[PDB]
Design a binder for this molecule. Structure first.
Ligand SMILES: C[C@@H](Oc1ccc2ncc3c(c2c1)CCOC3)c1cncc(-c2nc(Cl)c[nH]2)c1
Ligand SMILES: C[C@@H](Oc1ccc2ncc3c(c2c1)CCOC3)c1cncc(-c2nc(Cl)c[nH]2)c1
Ligand SMILES: C[C@@H](Oc1ccc2ncc3c(c2c1)CCOC3)c1cncc(-c2nc(Cl)c[nH]2)c1
Ligand SMILES: C[C@@H](Oc1ccc2ncc3c(c2c1)CCOC3)c1cncc(-c2nc(Cl)c[nH]2)c1
Ligand SMILES: C[C@@H](Oc1ccc2ncc3c(c2c1)CCOC3)c1cncc(-c2nc(Cl)c[nH]2)c1
Ligand SMILES: O=c1[nH]cnc2c1ncn2[C@@H]1O[C@H](COP(=O)(O)O)[C@@H](O)[C@H]1O
Ligand SMILES: O=c1[nH]cnc2c1ncn2[C@@H]1O[C@H](COP(=O)(O)O)[C@@H](O)[C@H]1O
Ligand SMILES: O=c1[nH]cnc2c1ncn2[C@@H]1O[C@H](COP(=O)(O)O)[C@@H](O)[C@H]1O
Ligand SMILES: O=c1[nH]cnc2c1ncn2[C@@H]1O[C@H](COP(=O)(O)O)[C@@H](O)[C@H]1O
Ligand SMILES: O=c1[nH]cnc2c1ncn2[C@@H]1O[C@H](COP(=O)(O)O)[C@@H](O)[C@H]1O
Lengths: 336, 337, 336, 336, 336
C-alpha cells in the first residue's frame, strides 16, 4: 500500500483528562504561563487577530484580565500603529493586569508577509508593541520562515511569533528562524472551511502534541482555534500548550469590534473568518455570520478560568507547568 | 510523542454482555450483594445523595425494596439527623426489606469534608445511621482520604464509603484509608457538565474495571452515575460493580423530594446536580438543573430495573450476583450498533 | 485488567462485500441453499415465527416463492396443527415452489419448552410439518438443548432446529443435541429491546461468523434478525449464513396476519415482538407498533432476491455456496 | 475466525492531508495531468457519463476549461456519434482548452458490453472521439475485460478506459487487457444504492490506494464518484488518482442536459443514477431526483480548481505529480 | 350618540362583479383608457413612483406595453430630468406603445410640494415629461391644492395630477384647482402602515366610488395601491377607476431598480414604502422588505391584462368605458 497515514489524529472531543491525586484547591492554583520565551501572562488566554474580535478595546480588556490581545491587520499601518498606542498609553481610574517592565498593558499585533510588512513592523515596534505575530494561513513556508528571521534580525527588541503550523517539522523550522513562540492550528477553527476547501487539517490535540513534542519547551506554543468550552482549554494545556487563542468565544462581547444588531428579538454581532469573502473584500477558506451578543467579556474570562482551575484541581496541578507535564488522557469513542 | 494516552476508555453504550450456557431462570436468580464489606443489600440498587432524589421518604422506600438510600447533605445537621431517625424507627403497617441487626431499616448519609463534618458525623452516628458516605467531587484527594481515615478511627462502629473515584490508584488510596467500599464515577452522570467545564472524566465501564481490578475484592465498589436502563446495571455489575447508585432513574418518582408541578399538560418534578448553581446557592457550576417527568411510585421502577437485571443473569447463566461479576464476557461494539 | 472483551463484534453496517472477478450474470446465479441438513430451499429466505408475520397464508406464499415459513406458536395446539395441514394440503389452480417428496408445500412450526411441548410437537408432526423449530430467547440453555434432543430421539422423521444462539459454544452444544440446523440471533431484531433491558447482544455479522466457524458446515445456520435491505442478506450469507429469517420486511404484507388499519391517510399493519407486553398478554423484551402496508409479499421477495443476485454478480458467485466460501469484506467507519 | 476482513477501508471524510514545507504559491501550481497514458488534460476534472450531466454542450465546456467530458450512452449510435462531431468541430468566436494534435477539443464517449458495442465503437472512432470508455457497474468481469481488449486490438488509434473497479486485482486485469486507464469507484456515488441493494462497496480513498498501489503508475486512474468538495479532489489525488470524475457537482449547471423546472420558488434540474428506474426504462441501483440549478459550470470548475491549488499550496506540491507522490494523511475519528 | 360613521366602507375583497349579458370575447375587448383628461393609454396600468419600482428602465417597459410609469422623486432635479430624457429619447430595433404627438414614449414624474418643486417642474417639463404628479401622502391639503393650481397656471402645456385622496370633497377641491386627474388611495398600499400608525384609511373600493361620484367623469381618477390580482383591477375600474397604479405587482421584475440578491436558494429584490425608514434616510408609515424576483415585467403585465380581459368578457364590456358605466357588484361576507 502507498497510502501514508501518519497517525490517528485526535481533537478535543476524542479525549478526557484523568483525575489524579490532589492536594490543591481550584481557588489556590496558579494560572500564570508563558506567551513567548520573554513574555509571561497571568492567565493563558489570547484574543484572536480578527477584525470581529480584537481591536484596542478588546486588547485593553485582555491585558487588564491577565492575558493579551493580538490586534488584527485588516487596517492600514497608521490605524494599527495607533491601536497599539491606545493600549500602550491606556490609564485606569485590575490586580492581575499583564504589563511590561514600564508598567504598561501589554499588546500584540498581527502582520503578514507581503510587501508592506517591513513598514508595518517598523511602525508597530515604534508604537511600543510587545510582540509581533507573523500571522499566516500556512506558517510552514519559506515566506513565513524568512519573515520571522527578518523581524528577529532587524527588531531583536520585540518578541516574534510565527504560525500557523501543525507539525513538529514546521515548529522546528520556525524555531531555527528565531521565533519566540509558535502558533498551532491548521483546520480547527470554528469558522474554518479549509478542511472542506483544501482537504487540509490536523486534529488540534494531536497537533499540539506534535509541536510540543518536537519543541521540548525551547519555546512556548499558542493553541489557536477550536476552543469551545473551558474543558477544551485544559485538554490543550495538558496536551502541551502554554496558551490558548480564542476567536468565537470572545466574539459578540461588548469589547469586540462591531455594532450590536437587533434581529428577530435577539441581539447579535458579526463573526467571520479572516479568510472569508467579506473579510478579503484565492478561494475563501472561512465563513461569515452572526454570533449572539454576550455582554462584557470579563464574565466569559472568569468562567473559562474557573473551569480550568477546576480541571487543575482534579489533576492535582498546582501551577500551569504541572498540567503540561503530568496530565494523563483516555481516548473515548463516539458514545463517550 | 509526549501525549500520555493510558487506554481507550469504554462507557456503557460501547459494550454488550455475551449470552452463555445457562441453567437458571430469571425468576430464580438471587440479587443479593454487599454495599460495604459489612453491609449486605437484597438488591444492588442505591439511591443518590441528591436533594431531588433521597430524603427519608425515599430512603424508606429503598430499604423496603431491598436496597438503601443515601440521604443528601444539603440540609443542616439537625435536619439530616432527623431524617436518619425517621427511617431508623419507621414501622410498617415487605419480605425483602434491608435491615440492621436490630431489625431496623438501613439508611446511609452523605457528609463532606468542610469544618462542619465532625459534628455532622457524630450526630448521624448518634442517630443510628448505618453508613457514612464521605461524598465529594474528587475523592482522590488528601481531604477525602484523611476524612475517610478519621471516620474509621473515630467511629469504627459504623461503615464508611469514600468517593467519588475513577482509577485503581484512587481506590487503593481509599482502601488504605479504612474505607469499607468506594464510590466510582467521575463525569458519567446525566446532570454532569464536568466533562465540558474541566475536560475531566473516565468512561464508566473502564472506570469500574480499573477500580475493581486494583481492589481484588477487598472492598466492594458502588457504580455511581450514568445508569439509563436495566441493561446498564448488568454491564456495571459484569464490569465489577457490586451495587449501582442512580439519581435520574428515581428522580420524579412519588417518593423523591419536591412538589409535582403542572406544565403544558405533563407533570414534572425537578432534578439537578449538586454542582448546579441552584444546588450551591466560588466554584463554577459542574452540573445542570431541570425538570424530569413525574413517574409515580418508585416501586414500579425498581421492579422493572430488577426484572431487566434478572433477564440478564438468565442470559449469562448467573445464579447469583457474584457469578455475574466473575464470569461475564463482553464484546466491544461500534457506533453503528 | 479484569474486563474480558472477546472481540470488537460487527453488525451489517460495519462491513461491505468486495467485488471480485466474475463470469456469471445476476440473472444466471442460483439461489438454492439448505434450511437444514435435510431440507433445501430454492431461495435462502425464511419468514419469522411471529403472530404478526407468519400464519398459514404467509407460509404458503413463502413456499410458493421457493422459501419456507415458521408458523408461530402463540396459538393453541389444535389451531397450529390446523395451520400446518392448511399449508400441507394447499392446492393451486409457481415453478420455484419448495416441496417435500410428496409434492406438498413445505412448512415449519415453532414450539417452546413449556409443559405443552410434547403434545404440540406430536400434533405438528402428525399434521405433516416439515421441520420443528425449538424457538426460544436463549438457546444456550439446558431446556433448549434437552428439548432439541427429545424431539430428535422421539420424532427422528422430522427435522429440528434450535435457537436462538450467538456463539460458537452454543452452536456446538445444539449440534451435539442433534439439531439439524441452528438459528442465529441474540439482539439484532428490529423490534428487540434486549440490549436495553438486559444489556445482552452479539452484533449479527460477528454472531454468524462465530457460529459458522464453530460448525464447519456440519449443519447450516439461519441468520435471524436485523435484516433491513437486500444488501444485508448478501453479507449474512457471505459471513456464513445459509438462510435468512426476516420479520419486519414481511410484516404489513397482505399475506401477513392481521387487518389493515386506516390512520391519517396512510395504511398500516401491526408488528410487535414476541416478547412485547401485548404478545405476552418476565419483563418485556420487545416493542409493539405499526408498519406501512406493503401489499403482496411476492414483490418484496422478488426485490430482495434481485439484490442478492446483483450481489452475487459483483462477487463472482454462481451459487450460494460460492458466496459462503469466497466473500471478502472490508470494515468501514461511521462516516462511510 | 473464518471472516475475511481485507482491511479497514477509508473514505474521504476519514482522512485529512497534512500541510508540509512549501515554496510555491497556490496561484503558481500546475494542474496538468494525464487522463490516459496518451491524453493529457490541463485540469484533473472529468464530467460523468450520465444523461443528466454530459452531452455535447457540457463536453464542450469541459474541454474549454482544460478537462474532458464523457458523453453518456443512453442514446442511439447515431445521436451519440453526432454529439462527438459537435464537440470535435465546435469553433469559438479559452487559453486552457484541452485539444488534440489538430487543435480540436478533446472528447470521450461511454460504451457498454452489449451487442451494439461493435457498431457504436466504430461510429464513435469514425466521428473522431479521443477516448472510448467501456462503462459498466462491474469492470472486474470477463465481459468488460474482453471488450476492452477488443477495442485496443480493433481500434489501436483510440484510447480506451475500462471501469468501474475498486481493487488492485481488477486494475491489473484491465491493464493486461490493454486499457490506457482505469475508472475507480464501486459504491461511492452520490446517487448510488448499490451499498444497500447488493451490500457491495469499497470506501473510495482505499479504492484509489488499492488501485494506485497495484498499477505502479503504468497507467493513470480516474477517481469516479463521491466527490462533494474540492477538498475531496485533493484527497483523491493525494491517494493516487490522476483525475476526478464528477456527476453531482456538475448536475444542475446550465450546460448539463435538461430543462430548468420551477418548484416552490426554487430552480432545479434533474439528477439521477444510470442504474435508476427512470433511466433504465436488474433491480435499480440508484435514485432519481432534483438538484438545485447552479448556473454556468465555469464558476463551479473555477471554484473547484481554486480549492485544489490551495491544497497544493498547503502541501508544497508544485505540480500534480508532487501531490500524488508526497501527500501525507492522518486518519480522523467521527468527532473529527 | 355623537359618533360619526360616514358609511360601511368596502375594499376589494368585500365585493364581486356580477356576470352580465355579453356578446364579446376577452380577445376582442379594448383596453384603451385615459390617464388624464389629455393623455390616453392603451392599457390602464401605471407603475408606482417608488425608488424600488419605477426609474427610466421600467418607465420604458411601461410605455412599450401601452402604459406609463411615474419616475420617483428620490433623486436630485438633475437626475430626474435625465431619467425623463432617457425615456423621451429612446428607440428600439411594440405596436401598442404609449406615445406623444412626436412619436415619443410617454413618461411621467413625481414632485413634492416644498422648496425645490419650482426648479423640479421646470427641469422636468423642459426635458419633455408628459405628466407631473404632485405626489403626497395627504392630497387634501392646502399644500397640494395650490401646487397643482401653480403647475396648471404656469405650465399649461403639461398635464398635472394631484393626490393622494380618498373622498369626493378632496377630489372636488383638486378638480377646481386645475387637476387633469387625481390619484385615489389613502391606506390601501401593500407596504402601507398608515392604518396602524395613524388610524387613518379608506377602503379602496369605497374610496374609488366616493371620488368617482364627485368627479362625474370631468376628470379620470387613478386607483393607487392595494392591487394584488388582476381581479382587483376589474373591480377598481368597475367602481369608477380609469387606471390602476401598482407598486408591489411590478417590484421584483427585471426592469425595476435595484440588484437581485441571493438568500437561501431563492432570488429577491428590494421593495419598500416611500414612508419607510430607509426611503426617508416623521415616524415611518411604510415597511421595508424583499419580494421574490419575478423576471421580465412583460409576463406580469400580460397576465394582468389577460385577467382584465376575462372580466370584461364576463361583464359584456367591449371597451373600458362599458365596464366603468355598467358594472354591478354584490357584497360578500367573510365566508366568501
Ligand atoms: C483565504 C484565506 O484563508 C485563511 C485566512 C486566514 C487563516 N488563518 C488561520 C488559519 C487558516 C486561515 C485561512 C486556515 C488554516 O488554519 C488556520 C487565505 C489567506 N492567505 C493564504 C491562504 C492559503 N495559503 C495557502 Cl498555501 C493555502 N491557503 C488562505
Ligand atoms: C461545582 C461542584 O460540582 C460537583 C458537585 C457534586 C459532584 N458529585 C459527583 C461528581 C461530580 C460532582 C461535581 C463531578 C465529578 O463526577 C462525580 C463541585 C463541588 N465541590 C467540588 C468541586 C470540584 N473539586 C475539584 Cl478538585 C474540582 N471541582 C465541584
Ligand atoms: C420477554 C420475552 O422476550 C423475548 C421473546 C422472544 C424473543 N425471541 C428472540 C430473541 C429474543 C426474544 C426475547 C431476545 C434475544 O434475541 C432473540 C422472553 C420470553 N421468554 C424468555 C425470555 C428470556 N429468557 C432469558 Cl434467559 C432471558 N429472557 C424473554
Ligand atoms: C442497475 C444498474 O446499476 C448501476 C448502473 C450504473 C452504474 N455505474 C457505476 C456504478 C454502479 C452502477 C450501477 C454501481 C457500482 O458503483 C459504480 C446496473 C447496470 N448494469 C449492471 C449492474 C450490475 N452488474 C452486476 Cl455484476 C451487479 N449489478 C447494475
Ligand atoms: C412618512 C411618509 O409616509 C408616506 C409616504 C408616502 C406615501 N404615499 C402614499 C400614501 C401614504 C404615504 C405615506 C400613506 C397614506 O396612503 C397613501 C410621509 C411623508 N410625508 C408626509 C406624511 C404625512 N403627512 C400627513 Cl398630513 C400625515 N403623514 C407621511
Ligand atoms: O477564515 C478563516 N479560516 C480558517 N481559519 C481562520 C480564519 N480566520 C481565522 N482563522 C483561525 O481561527 C481562529 C479562531 O478560531 P475559533 O476560536 O475556533 O473561532 C483564529 O485564531 C485563526 O487561527
Ligand atoms: O452537579 C453535579 N455534577 C456532576 N455529577 C454530579 C452532580 N450532582 C451529582 N452528581 C453525580 O451524578 C450521579 C447521578 O447520576 P445519574 O443517575 O446519571 O443522574 C450522583 O450519584 C453523583 O455521583
Ligand atoms: O420481543 C422480541 N424481542 C427480541 N427479539 C424478538 C422478539 N420477537 C421476535 N424476536 C426476534 O426478532 C426476529 C425478527 O427481527 P426483524 O426481522 O429485524 O424484524 C424474529 O425472527 C425473532 O428471532
Ligand atoms: O445508478 C447508479 N448507481 C451507482 N453508481 C452510479 C449510478 N449512475 C452513475 N453512477 C456512478 O456515480 C458517479 C457519479 O457520482 P457523484 O459525482 O458522487 O454524483 C458516476 O460517475 C458513476 O460512476
Ligand atoms: O411608505 C408608504 N406608506 C404608505 N403608502 C405608501 C408608501 N409608499 C408608497 N405607498 C403607496 O402605495 C402604493 C403602492 O401600493 P401596492 O401596489 O399595494 O404595493 C404607491 O403607489 C403609494 O401610493
Amino acid at each position: 500500500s502507498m497510502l501514508t497515514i501518519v497517525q490517528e489524529a485526535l481533537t478535543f472531543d476524542d479525549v478526557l483528562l484523568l483525575p489524579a491525586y490532589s492536594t490543591v484547591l481550584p481557588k489556590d492554583v496558579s494560572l500564570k504561563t508563558r506567551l513567548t520565551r520573554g513574555i509571561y501572562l497571568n492567565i493563558p488566554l489570547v484574543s484572536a487577530a480578527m477584525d470581529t474580535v480584537t481591536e484596542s478595546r478588546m486588547a485593553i480588556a485582555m491585558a487588564q484580565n491577565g492575558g493579551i490581545g493580538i490586534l488584527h491587520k485588516n487596517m492600514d499601518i497608521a490605524a494599527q500603529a495607533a491601536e497599539v498606542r491606545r493600549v500602550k498609553k491606556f490609564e485606569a481610574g485590575y490586580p492581575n493586569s499583564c504589563k511590561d517592565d514600564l508598567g504598561r498593558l501589554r499588546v500584540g499585533a498581527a502582520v503578514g508577509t507581503g510587501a508592506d510588512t517591513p513598514s508595518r513592523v517598523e511602525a508597530l515596534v515604534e508604537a511600543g508593541v510587545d510582540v509581533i505575530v507573523v500571522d499566516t494561513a500556512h506558517g510552514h513556508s519559506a515566506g513565513v520562515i524568512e519573515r520571522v528571521r527578518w523581524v528577529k534580525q532587524n527588531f531583536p527588541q520585540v518578541q516574534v511569533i510565527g504560525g500557523n503550523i501543525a507539525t513538529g517539522d514546521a515548529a522546528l523550522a520556525l524555531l531555527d528562524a528565531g521565533a519566540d513562540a509558535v502558533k498551532v492550528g491548521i483546520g480547527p477553527g470554528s469558522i474554518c472551511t479549509t478542511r472542506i476547501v483544501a482537504g487540509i487539517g490536523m486534529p488540534q490535540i494531536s497537533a499540539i502534541d506534535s509541536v510540543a513534542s518536537a519543541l521540548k519547551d525551547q519555546i512556548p506554543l499558542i493553541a489557536d482555534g477550536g476552543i469551545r468550552f473551558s474543558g477544551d482549554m485544559a485538554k490543550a494545556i495538558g496536551a502541551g500548550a502554554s496558551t490558548i487563542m480564542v476567536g468565537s468565544l470572545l466574539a459578540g462581547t461588548e469589547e469586540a469590534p462591531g455594532e450590536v444588531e437587533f434581529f428577530q428579538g435577539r441581539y447579535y454581532k458579526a463573526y467571520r473568518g479572516m479568510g472569508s469573502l467579506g473579510a478579503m473584500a484565492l478561494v475563501p477558506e472561512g465563513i461569515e455570520g452572526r454570533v449572539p451578543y454576550k455582554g462584557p467579556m470579563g464574565n466569559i474570562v472568569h468562567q473559562m478560568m474557573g473551569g480550568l482551575r477546576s480541571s487543575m484541581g482534579y489533576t492535582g496541578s498546582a501551577v500551569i507547568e504541572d498540567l503540561r507535564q503530568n496530565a494523563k488522557f483516555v481516548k473515548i469513542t463516539s458514545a463517550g
